Amino acid sequence: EPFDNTTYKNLQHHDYSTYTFLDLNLDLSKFRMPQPSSGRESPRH
Amino acid sequence: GALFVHRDTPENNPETPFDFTPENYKRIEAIVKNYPEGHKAAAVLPVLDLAQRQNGWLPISAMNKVAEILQVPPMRVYEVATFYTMYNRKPVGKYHIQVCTTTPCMLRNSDSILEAIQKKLGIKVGETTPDKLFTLIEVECLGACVNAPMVQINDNYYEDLTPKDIEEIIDELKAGKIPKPGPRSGRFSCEPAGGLTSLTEPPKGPGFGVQAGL
Amino acid sequence: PKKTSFGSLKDEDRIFTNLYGRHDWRLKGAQSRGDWYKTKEILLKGPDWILGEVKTSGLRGRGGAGFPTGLKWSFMNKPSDGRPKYLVVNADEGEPGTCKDREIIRHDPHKLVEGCLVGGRAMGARAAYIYIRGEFYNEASNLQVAIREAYEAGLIGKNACGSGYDFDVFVVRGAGAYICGEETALIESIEGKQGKPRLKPPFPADVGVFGCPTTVANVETVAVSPTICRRGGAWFASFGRERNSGTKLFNISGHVNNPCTVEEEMSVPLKELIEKHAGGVTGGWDNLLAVIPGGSSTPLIPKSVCETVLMDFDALIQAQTGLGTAAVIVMDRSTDIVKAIARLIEFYKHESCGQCTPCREGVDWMNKVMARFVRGDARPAEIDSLWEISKQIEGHTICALGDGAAWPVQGLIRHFRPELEERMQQFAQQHQ
Amino acid sequence: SNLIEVFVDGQSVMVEPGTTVLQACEKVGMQIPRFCYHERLSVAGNCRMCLVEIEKAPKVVAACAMPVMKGWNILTNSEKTKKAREGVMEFLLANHPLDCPICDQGGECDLQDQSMMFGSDRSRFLEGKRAVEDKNIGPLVKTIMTRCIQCTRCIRFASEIAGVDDLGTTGRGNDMQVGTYIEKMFMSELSGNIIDICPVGALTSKPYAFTARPWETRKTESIDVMDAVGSNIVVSTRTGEVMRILPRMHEDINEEWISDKTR
Ligand SMILES: Cc1cc2nc3c(=O)[nH]c(=O)nc-3n(C[C@H](O)[C@H](O)[C@H](O)COP(=O)(O)O)c2cc1C
Ligand code: SF4
Ligand code: SF4
Ligand code: SF4
Ligand code: FES
Ligand code: FES
Ligand SMILES: [K+]
């Protein structure tokens, strides 16, 4: 707790797997607000 | 080389087996919801990279699958695959070594790092080792400019390397261990080597210097 | 009295207080350094008040162009026409020499997440797509963890900070391209197409990502917005000269004793920045040959000009160069200046998008010519020809990559023509 | 009305809002150079051959994609406009191959004519050129892609007019190549039209290969009878022999296209 400025606190990324980013993106799906609608399924529709 | 025209081969053809694992379909489902409805073509890049993290490279069949599930024309996924350089359209080694050789890294003797790897692995730039464990290619600036010379092996940056240091990393990878990312010089990050010259004071706590109105 | 000498910034004025990552970077470690403080109060002040603080603070774009940030963000302050509105944070740090944006998303991600909210509310945006370069996988994972904390803490999402404002932060990873740092080419990547820039008009404020209004902003130019609003725009205008105010992150690299990323006040003398923070030039300040002040797209300046030039937008423009991303690349006498600039042209050849003729066919033309200048396999009459070729590329292209490839050549010819000619005289006699 | 006033070399002209600088010059009989712009395709703005100076502006504007603002004086023949056309034409011809004698587009080539009308008269290019490998896209269109100038007219036409998303650009930079990437045939009822809209000899007719030259043909304006649409055509003949069929513009029937059977 005492002010310490001699250690690297960003060590969590030493054990990130290949799917870490996509796993986090999957967890941030129930918080997202509903997307806007263009009105068509795609520009080719 | 890396030609930008596809020719069918027994090991790379539209009938080559590829399909997303059941878990990846869930990840793809979350990817598509990050974009407005009716603009599902915006998921080509993240989905293409996902198809590469499962396989390790993008066969012509993998590109067709990405087109199939996003309802995008196949030619519009070939454009993405060939434009962005992180997509591997041929098999690579288990550890894709990428040496930065742009001027900031060149000025700090990045050629010595490249020389050390070739002698150590017994390969040349752009070649895969006989055991299919290492692929070596030069790349442009990777961001870790102040920590030059540096290399990227898969998804990790190894920085402040010297000809001795990089060879240690290859030995650790050729045994099975997981080398620790970051600089190998004594420092931890972009901080100056000879001790900090700034931010050497307890940072001010919440609500310091706030304006009167706020 | 307005200050005449600038620099010697104090640790109480540095916005990025965890630049070196020595402290905790999670939500608990950020709320102790002033992040997410009175965010709801700032949001309820409205967009005009937020844009008023940024406008009066003198903040200018930190991505390299340097446009006034307050005026640019104001183009989005217009009534809705039925389309969504988005903020796109450009984290596609790919300018050779620049590492500042990497140290913000890896050690101060919450200072960026809050900036998206503060900047987005000022623009009336409903989401903030953060385009992070593909190679920054570990930094993009930290930013995803920080965003998850903000959602769980109620700081973003629905009813952000308890302010009644809906906001989302999305992180989209690039697939590897320097051109995807350009504002219009970054939009095309988010839309799933090739990273080929667009013509303007239409500007992103009118037609942008998904065809909706958009404002592309740099990581640093968005991460300082919350601190400007909290401490006011008057405080941010205290530093630097007139129209060059603020604090800037500097990446000193190349032939220096202690390459580092350090925050410093704008208008700090270049000779003071290199010696105070980076341990001086290798072999002493008298061993300096040239410095590229603003990355790689900015022309190099020789030692005879670095002894007095200031590190701000207007001071460097007066010296026939630019501030760019404030990435200082130092070269000493041992350096081969022609081979060091030729490799930069080779970088632009590889990173050219190939869309438009002058840079598709001209950047690869300059690369061939510069390749022979390295060996001296040319004649002096080609130096003037290379100048005209660069002037034909510059200003005739869709994006500013073409200009960024011409400027390095012009600086070399402007300040090192005797080196080129001498290299040619040596080649002739040797092959005789 | 809502018409706004712009000047083309000092001559006033009233144009509707949304009009482009290139279209404003048409109203006064002036035709801006072009390789990528086609009046019936999407605006690309990537050949940079239409750059035109705007008075009191330091930067040249893409005349094909720049909407005209009120009170603009478009300078179509200034030194800046003419020096922009020489540089762009010089970059187009840097890697172009010396194929004119053996190229079916010789004599009716926009790159030849705009090189002799708006470009320089010599080259200062002292390097080796690029060479691209040819591609097979059917029995009708012969491809020699070393001559391609990356104008993307075939890409836009195939996607917009023909509704076939088979063509595209692979790679990036100087090595950017137009093609189908995979071995595929662009067999469409409107496939022959990519021959015409290709300003260079990169796309040419295979049946017509090497048989004639443009100057020696006689043009007979006739009607197509392969269907009931009545497409207007030009029957090119030489010494009493039919050589090729070409579209003849008719806004109300067939635009400037014809089907493969007609062609
Ligand atoms: C070739 C090229 C690459 C660029 N790369 C970046 C980048 O990596 N990060 C960034 O913030 N701006 C970059 N820019 C500048 C952007 O186009 C744009 O000016 C900036 O992102 C807008 O944000 P700002 O107001 O902070 O300047 C680049 C421009 C060009 C022409
Ligand atoms: S200048 Fe180069 S990178 Fe920029 S749009 Fe034109 S071709 Fe693409
Ligand atoms: S396309 Fe035109 S310039 Fe090129 S070889 Fe054919 S006729 Fe000559
Ligand atoms: S093949 Fe012809 S039409 Fe297609 S891009 Fe090349 S020059 Fe243009
Ligand atoms: S030049 Fe190698 S990290 Fe920037
Ligand atoms: S005709 Fe305008 S850029 Fe091609
Ligand atoms: K043609």
mmCIF file with all atom_site columns, N, CA and C in Angstrom, chain D residues 33-55:
data_model
loop_
_atom_site.group_PDB
_atom_site.id
_atom_site.type_symbol
_atom_site.label_atom_id
_atom_site.label_alt_id
_atom_site.label_comp_id
_atom_site.label_asym_id
_atom_site.label_entity_id
_atom_site.label_seq_id
_atom_site.pdbx_PDB_ins_code
_atom_site.Cartn_x
_atom_site.Cartn_y
_atom_site.Cartn_z
_atom_site.occupancy
_atom_site.B_iso_or_equiv
_atom_site.pdbx_formal_charge
_atom_site.auth_seq_id
_atom_site.auth_comp_id
_atom_site.auth_asym_id
_atom_site.auth_atom_id
_atom_site.pdbx_PDB_model_num
ATOM 1  N N  . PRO D 1 33 ? -9.410  15.667 -68.828 1.00 0.00 ? 33 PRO D N  1
ATOM 2  C CA . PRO D 1 33 ? -8.824  14.330 -68.987 1.00 0.00 ? 33 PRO D CA 1
ATOM 3  C C  . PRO D 1 33 ? -9.308  13.374 -67.907 1.00 0.00 ? 33 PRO D C  1
ATOM 4  N N  . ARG D 1 34 ? -9.357  12.091 -68.255 1.00 0.00 ? 34 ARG D N  1
ATOM 5  C CA . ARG D 1 34 ? -9.918  11.095 -67.353 1.00 0.00 ? 34 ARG D CA 1
ATOM 6  C C  . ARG D 1 34 ? -9.469  9.703  -67.773 1.00 0.00 ? 34 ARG D C  1
ATOM 7  N N  . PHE D 1 35 ? -9.258  8.849  -66.781 1.00 0.00 ? 35 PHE D N  1
ATOM 8  C CA . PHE D 1 35 ? -9.085  7.414  -66.978 1.00 0.00 ? 35 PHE D CA 1
ATOM 9  C C  . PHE D 1 35 ? -10.023 6.592  -66.110 1.00 0.00 ? 35 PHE D C  1
ATOM 10 N N  . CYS D 1 36 ? -10.288 7.032  -64.883 1.00 0.00 ? 36 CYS D N  1
ATOM 11 C CA . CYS D 1 36 ? -11.130 6.273  -63.970 1.00 0.00 ? 36 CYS D CA 1
ATOM 12 C C  . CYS D 1 36 ? -12.586 6.703  -64.024 1.00 0.00 ? 36 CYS D C  1
ATOM 13 N N  . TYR D 1 37 ? -12.854 7.983  -64.262 1.00 0.00 ? 37 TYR D N  1
ATOM 14 C CA . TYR D 1 37 ? -14.228 8.456  -64.281 1.00 0.00 ? 37 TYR D CA 1
ATOM 15 C C  . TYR D 1 37 ? -14.962 7.908  -65.495 1.00 0.00 ? 37 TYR D C  1
ATOM 16 N N  . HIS D 1 38 ? -16.129 7.326  -65.253 1.00 0.00 ? 38 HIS D N  1
ATOM 17 C CA . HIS D 1 38 ? -17.079 6.992  -66.300 1.00 0.00 ? 38 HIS D CA 1
ATOM 18 C C  . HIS D 1 38 ? -18.432 7.545  -65.886 1.00 0.00 ? 38 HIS D C  1
ATOM 19 N N  . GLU D 1 39 ? -19.135 8.156  -66.837 1.00 0.00 ? 39 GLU D N  1
ATOM 20 C CA . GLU D 1 39 ? -20.385 8.829  -66.515 1.00 0.00 ? 39 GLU D CA 1
ATOM 21 C C  . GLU D 1 39 ? -21.487 7.866  -66.090 1.00 0.00 ? 39 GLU D C  1
ATOM 22 N N  . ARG D 1 40 ? -21.295 6.556  -66.260 1.00 0.00 ? 40 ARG D N  1
ATOM 23 C CA . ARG D 1 40 ? -22.311 5.567  -65.916 1.00 0.00 ? 40 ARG D CA 1
ATOM 24 C C  . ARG D 1 40 ? -21.871 4.616  -64.810 1.00 0.00 ? 40 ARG D C  1
ATOM 25 N N  . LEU D 1 41 ? -20.727 4.858  -64.181 1.00 0.00 ? 41 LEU D N  1
ATOM 26 C CA . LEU D 1 41 ? -20.247 4.055  -63.065 1.00 0.00 ? 41 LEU D CA 1
ATOM 27 C C  . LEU D 1 41 ? -20.105 4.938  -61.829 1.00 0.00 ? 41 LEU D C  1
ATOM 28 N N  . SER D 1 42 ? -19.705 4.319  -60.722 1.00 0.00 ? 42 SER D N  1
ATOM 29 C CA . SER D 1 42 ? -19.440 5.067  -59.505 1.00 0.00 ? 42 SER D CA 1
ATOM 30 C C  . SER D 1 42 ? -18.189 5.923  -59.672 1.00 0.00 ? 42 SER D C  1
ATOM 31 N N  . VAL D 1 43 ? -18.131 7.008  -58.909 1.00 0.00 ? 43 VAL D N  1
ATOM 32 C CA . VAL D 1 43 ? -16.985 7.910  -58.955 1.00 0.00 ? 43 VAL D CA 1
ATOM 33 C C  . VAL D 1 43 ? -15.869 7.309  -58.114 1.00 0.00 ? 43 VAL D C  1
ATOM 34 N N  . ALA D 1 44 ? -14.728 7.045  -58.749 1.00 0.00 ? 44 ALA D N  1
ATOM 35 C CA . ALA D 1 44 ? -13.575 6.464  -58.078 1.00 0.00 ? 44 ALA D CA 1
ATOM 36 C C  . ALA D 1 44 ? -12.590 7.522  -57.604 1.00 0.00 ? 44 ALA D C  1
ATOM 37 N N  . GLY D 1 45 ? -12.198 8.433  -58.486 1.00 0.00 ? 45 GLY D N  1
ATOM 38 C CA . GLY D 1 45 ? -11.269 9.485  -58.118 1.00 0.00 ? 45 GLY D CA 1
ATOM 39 C C  . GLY D 1 45 ? -9.890  8.986  -57.751 1.00 0.00 ? 45 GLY D C  1
ATOM 40 N N  . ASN D 1 46 ? -9.387  7.971  -58.456 1.00 0.00 ? 46 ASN D N  1
ATOM 41 C CA . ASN D 1 46 ? -8.122  7.344  -58.109 1.00 0.00 ? 46 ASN D CA 1
ATOM 42 C C  . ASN D 1 46 ? -7.080  7.398  -59.218 1.00 0.00 ? 46 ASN D C  1
ATOM 43 N N  . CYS D 1 47 ? -7.397  7.958  -60.383 1.00 0.00 ? 47 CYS D N  1
ATOM 44 C CA . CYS D 1 47 ? -6.386  8.113  -61.419 1.00 0.00 ? 47 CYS D CA 1
ATOM 45 C C  . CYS D 1 47 ? -5.689  9.461  -61.351 1.00 0.00 ? 47 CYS D C  1
ATOM 46 N N  . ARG D 1 48 ? -6.295  10.441 -60.684 1.00 0.00 ? 48 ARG D N  1
ATOM 47 C CA . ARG D 1 48 ? -5.700  11.754 -60.465 1.00 0.00 ? 48 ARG D CA 1
ATOM 48 C C  . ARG D 1 48 ? -5.317  12.441 -61.771 1.00 0.00 ? 48 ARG D C  1
ATOM 49 N N  . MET D 1 49 ? -5.910  12.026 -62.887 1.00 0.00 ? 49 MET D N  1
ATOM 50 C CA . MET D 1 49 ? -5.658  12.655 -64.175 1.00 0.00 ? 49 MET D CA 1
ATOM 51 C C  . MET D 1 49 ? -6.590  13.827 -64.448 1.00 0.00 ? 49 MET D C  1
ATOM 52 N N  . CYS D 1 50 ? -7.629  14.005 -63.638 1.00 0.00 ? 50 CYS D N  1
ATOM 53 C CA . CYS D 1 50 ? -8.590  15.083 -63.815 1.00 0.00 ? 50 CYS D CA 1
ATOM 54 C C  . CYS D 1 50 ? -8.308  16.269 -62.905 1.00 0.00 ? 50 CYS D C  1
ATOM 55 N N  . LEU D 1 51 ? -7.145  16.301 -62.259 1.00 0.00 ? 51 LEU D N  1
ATOM 56 C CA . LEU D 1 51 ? -6.822  17.401 -61.362 1.00 0.00 ? 51 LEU D CA 1
ATOM 57 C C  . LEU D 1 51 ? -6.889  18.723 -62.110 1.00 0.00 ? 51 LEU D C  1
ATOM 58 N N  . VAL D 1 52 ? -7.588  19.688 -61.523 1.00 0.00 ? 52 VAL D N  1
ATOM 59 C CA . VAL D 1 52 ? -7.795  20.995 -62.133 1.00 0.00 ? 52 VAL D CA 1
ATOM 60 C C  . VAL D 1 52 ? -7.623  22.056 -61.059 1.00 0.00 ? 52 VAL D C  1
ATOM 61 N N  . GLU D 1 53 ? -6.950  23.145 -61.415 1.00 0.00 ? 53 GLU D N  1
ATOM 62 C CA . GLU D 1 53 ? -6.743  24.233 -60.474 1.00 0.00 ? 53 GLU D CA 1
ATOM 63 C C  . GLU D 1 53 ? -8.035  25.010 -60.261 1.00 0.00 ? 53 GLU D C  1
ATOM 64 N N  . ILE D 1 54 ? -8.276  25.397 -59.013 1.00 0.00 ? 54 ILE D N  1
ATOM 65 C CA . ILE D 1 54 ? -9.364  26.295 -58.647 1.00 0.00 ? 54 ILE D CA 1
ATOM 66 C C  . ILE D 1 54 ? -8.738  27.615 -58.222 1.00 0.00 ? 54 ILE D C  1
ATOM 67 N N  . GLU D 1 55 ? -9.209  28.712 -58.808 1.00 0.00 ? 55 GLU D N  1
ATOM 68 C CA . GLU D 1 55 ? -8.576  30.000 -58.567 1.00 0.00 ? 55 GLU D CA 1
ATOM 69 C C  . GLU D 1 55 ? -8.638  30.357 -57.088 1.00 0.00 ? 55 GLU D C  1
#
